[PDB]
Amino acid sequence: RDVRILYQVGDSEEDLPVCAPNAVCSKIDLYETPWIERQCRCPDGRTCPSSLGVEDGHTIADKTRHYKMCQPVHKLPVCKHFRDYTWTLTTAAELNVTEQIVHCRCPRNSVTYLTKREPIGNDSPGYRYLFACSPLTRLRCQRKQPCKLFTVRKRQEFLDEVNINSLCQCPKGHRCPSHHTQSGVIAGESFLEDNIQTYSGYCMAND
Amino acid sequence: VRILYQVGDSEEDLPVCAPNAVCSKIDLYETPWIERQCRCPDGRTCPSSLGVEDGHTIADKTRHYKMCQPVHKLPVCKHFRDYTWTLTTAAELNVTEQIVHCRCPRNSVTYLTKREPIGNDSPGYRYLFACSPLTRLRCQRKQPCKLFTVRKRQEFLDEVNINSLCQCPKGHRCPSHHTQSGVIAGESFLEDNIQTYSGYCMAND
Numbered sequence: 577r578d579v580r581i582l583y584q585v586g587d588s589e590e591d592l593p594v595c596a597p598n599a600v601c602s603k604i605d606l607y608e609t610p611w612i613e614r615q616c617r618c619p620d621g622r623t624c625p626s627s628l629g630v631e632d633g634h635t636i637a638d639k640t641r642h643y644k645m646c647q648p649v650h651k652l653p654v655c656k657h658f659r660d661y662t663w664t665l666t667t668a669a670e671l672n673v674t675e676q677i678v679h680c681r682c683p684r685n686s687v688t689y690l691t692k693r694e695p696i697g698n699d700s701p702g703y704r705y706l707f708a709c710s711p712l713t714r715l716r717c718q719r720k721q722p723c724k725l726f727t728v729r730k731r732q733e734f735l736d737e738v739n740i741n742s743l744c745q746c747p748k749g750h751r752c753p754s755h756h757t758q759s760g761v762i763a764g765e766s767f768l769e770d771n772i773q774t775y776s777g778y779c780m781a782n783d
Numbered sequence: 784v785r786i787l788y789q790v791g792d793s794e795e796d797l798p799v800c801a802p803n804a805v806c807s808k809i810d811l812y813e814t815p816w817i818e819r820q821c822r823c824p825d826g827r828t829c830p831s832s833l834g835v836e837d838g839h840t841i842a843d844k845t846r847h848y849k850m851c852q853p854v855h856k857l858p859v860c861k862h863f864r865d866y867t868w869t870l871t872t873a874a875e876l877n878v879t880e881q882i883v884h885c886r887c888p889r890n891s892v893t894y895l896t897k898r899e900p901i902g903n904d905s906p907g908y909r910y911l912f913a914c915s916p917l918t919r920l921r922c923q924r925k926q927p928c929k930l931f932t933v934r935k936r937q938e939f940l941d942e943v944n945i946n947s948l949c950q951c952p953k954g955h956r957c958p959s960h961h962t963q964s965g966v967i968a969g970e971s972f973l974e975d976n977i978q979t980y981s982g983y984c985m986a987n988d
Contacts, residue, residue, distance in 0.1 A: 577836065606811040606845075607845075609842060610833075610834060629833055631784065637814055639813065640845070685813070710940065732890060734947035739940070740940070740941045741940055
């Protein structure tokens, strides 16, 4: 009974890998019909929370999603530096599995967004997706620093959801594009797993 | 779990629900909160589970709506632009009422469509919501093809929901974004930070 439970690999706790330190153990999507996707098994002597709320102290709430941790979330530092990565999502070539390691927590009402993709590195073929926390206060943009990031999700055949994050203040004599097909915007990262596509907008010459 | 009331600060200040009213609204975006709307006409109590298994819940995008009686007792909407529910907000009253008229078919999502007067002796409006199409029809001249719902999340974050309502006749294309010419301001709902825009079929190329 209760919430429909799926697994990123196989079809049961059995098929699941063991979690590394500070990894997401379960992903809860609460958009239409709430579902829980098991990522891994907690290294003992601990176990995965399954509450749909955030009261247990093991949950990171993020827009439309909840991420369950094995250890209490307060043991993680709060992020305060620029483009410190709140978490990284790694996907390996030969692995049927993906890991999401949390490095820090975004401050009150700061939303994560996909910012970078990069090769895992030496030994592993694959990619690493980087997420950061949106700025609490708005500063001046520098060259090559994006002022706007558009995240387009295909929710279904006939429903698209576009999140628009305003990152910094364009300098006098300049303005930031308002929609993602406008000029001064290029395609960023295309994380197909979540059916998302990112676009970055840069400060453009006025008029 | 965070508990709010739309009037006063306790269960005592709440009025009683009329037939088929939403008794509690739950938002699950960011930090989950529950806003108590009204007290169920006994012998019943307003459900509080965050899930949709109790049979009293309608899930819609970011939100859950709780009802006193099970949801199956409500017909499933078939006609297009049958109003799934109406939100009424009065001038003198310290409270609002959402009456549910029918259920959208699976995965289909709701959107604000019209705003008509409550009329008569009490001032205020009635907001009308309809179900999103699960099949693509050919657009009849004059009917909007695209709906844009702009919701202001926080100071530096907007969320644009774009619904595709139907297929433009050949030799025409529906607009892609809300500032493009061929789109006008639809309805505003300040309470919920939304502004809708409707797109219509335009001259191709």
